[PDB]
C-alpha cells in the first residue's frame with residue numbers, strides 16, 4: 406500500500422506493518438526554559454512512553470520564549486530516548502530551531518497557512534511535515550468537501566515550497582474549527598482523506614467532543630478515545646496521536662491483527 | 667433499519683437506537699445450588715452491571731444439577747434487577763426451566779444442533795433465541811462461506827420448530843471451532859452475516875485469540891476486547907456480550923455517536 410518508508414534522519418518508519426503511535430509529551434513548564442525539573446520530567450515521561458509502545462514523541466511549544474522552552478527538551482530527549490521527535494509548532498522560526506536541536510518531523514496545526522515559510526523550513530531540512538486541517542472560522546458549505554479542499558490548499562503551499570510528496574502527512578484536525586457534531590461527521594467520513602494519496606495522522610485524544618457524547622471529564626476519556634482510535638484505524642489512518650500510550654498501543658495492535666495490517 | 671423491536675415479555679429492546687450490552691453474569695458456585703453466598707454474589711453483580719450500563723444479564727449453567735444451580739439465580743435476579751435475562755444453555759430441559767423461572771432469552775452455543783428440541787422450547791414460550799456458530803470439528807473449505815452455511819442450518823431447525831424470524835438473533839461464535847487465525851478472519855468479515863437478515867450478537871470478551879495477538883493474560887485483555895467491540899459495532903452488530911460492562915458501554919456509546927446509530 407505505501408511503496409516507500411517515512412524517512413526520519415536516523416530512524417525510518419515503515420507505514421505498512423503497523424499503526425504508528427505518536428506519544429504526546431507532557432510539557433508542564435517551570436515558573437522560572439532549560440531548568441532541571443521540567444527537562445527531567447519531560448525525559449522521564451518520554452521514556453515511559455517509549456517503554457509502553459510509542460513510535461514518535463510529540464513535543465509542544467511569544468516566539469523567542471517558545472524556543473527557550475522547547476529547544477532544551479528536544480536536546481535532552483533526542484539524546485536520552487531513541488525515537489523520532491515531532492515538533493508541534495506553526496511558527497517557521499520555532500520549527501527551524503527544533504530540527505537544529507534534534508527534532509525529526511514538523512507537526513503544523515495550521516497546515517502551512519499560519520506561516521507559509523514553515524514549509525520552506527521543511528523543504529530545506531527535508532523533514533516530514535504534518536499538515537492539519539484548521540481554519541479561522543466555521544462556515545462550512547460542505548464539511549468534508551471543504552475539509553479536503555482546505556487540506557489541498559495546504560499541499561499546494563507545501564509543494565510550491567519544495568516539499569516532496571513523500572514528506573507529506575495529512576491530519577483531519579478533529580477538534581479544530583468544527584462543532585461537536587462536525588467532529589463526529591469527520592470521524593464517520595475519515596476514509597475520504599485517502600483519495601488525496603497521503604498518509605493520515607488522527608489526533609482525537611481526550612478532546613471535548615468525546616465528553617460531549619459521553620458526558621465525562623477529561624480524565625474519564627480513555628474508552629471514548631479508544632473508540633475514535635479504532636474507527637480511525639479501520640478507516641485507514643497510518644498514525645494516531647495519543648496521551649495514553651499503553652492502552653492505545655494495545656488497541657492499535659488488536660485492530661491491526663483484525664483489519665489485516 | 668430494524669422495522670420491529672426485540673420483544674421480551676415485560677421489557678422491549680429497540681434495535682436501532684444503540685448497541686445493546688449483554689453483561690456476563692459471574693457464577694462462582696458453592697461447594698455445597700440455592701445457597702446464600704452464591705445467589706447473593708450473583709445478585710450484587712447483576713446489580714453492578716445494571717448500574718454500569720448493561721441491557722441484558724447473561725446467566726450461564728449434569729442436567730438436573732445445572733437446573734438446581736441456575737434456577738435460583740434467575741429467580742433472585744429477575745426479582746431484584748429489572749433487566750431481561752438470557753439463559754446460556756444448549757439443553758432443552760434446562761432452557762424450559764429457566765424461562766419458567768423468569769428468563770427472557772435463550773442463548774444457545776450449539777445453535778439448536780446440540781438438542782433440536784430447544785427450538786421447540788423457544789417456539790412455545792415465544793422467546794428470542796441466540797443461535798451461535800459452532801461445530802464439532804475444524805475442517806473449513808471456506809471459513810465464512812461455511813460459517814454462513816452452518817448458521818443457516820440453525821435457522822432452518824429454529825423455523826421448522828415454530829420460531830418466528832423476529833425471535834432469531836445470530837452470533838458468529840468467535841472462539842468456537844476456529845483457530846486463532848480463523849477468529850481474526852471472522853472479525854475481518856463480520857459484515858457478511860448481515861446478508862442473512864437477522865440481528866447479530868458478538869461475544870469476544872477476554873478470549874484467547876486476543877491473548878494470541880497481544881500476548882497478554884486474561885486479566886490483561888480490556889483494550890483488546892475494546893478493539894473487537896468497536897470493529898464489531900462498525901461492522902453492524904446489534905448486541906455485544908462482555909464481562910467489562912462499564913468500559914464497553916462507554917466504547918459502544920462513542921462508536922454509536924460516530925457511526926450515526
Ligand SMILES: Nc1nc(N)c(N=O)c(=O)[nH]1
Pocket residue numbers: 493512513514535537576578579580606607608609646
Ligand atoms: N497533528 C496534530 N497536532 C496537534 N497539536 C493536535 N492537537 O490535538 C492534533 O489533533 N493533531
Ligand SMILES: Nc1nc(N)c(N=O)c(=O)[nH]1
Pocket residue numbers: 754773774775796798837839840841867868869870907
Ligand atoms: N452467544 C454467546 N454465548 C456464549 N456463551 C459465548 N461464549 O463466549 C459467546 O461468544 N456467544
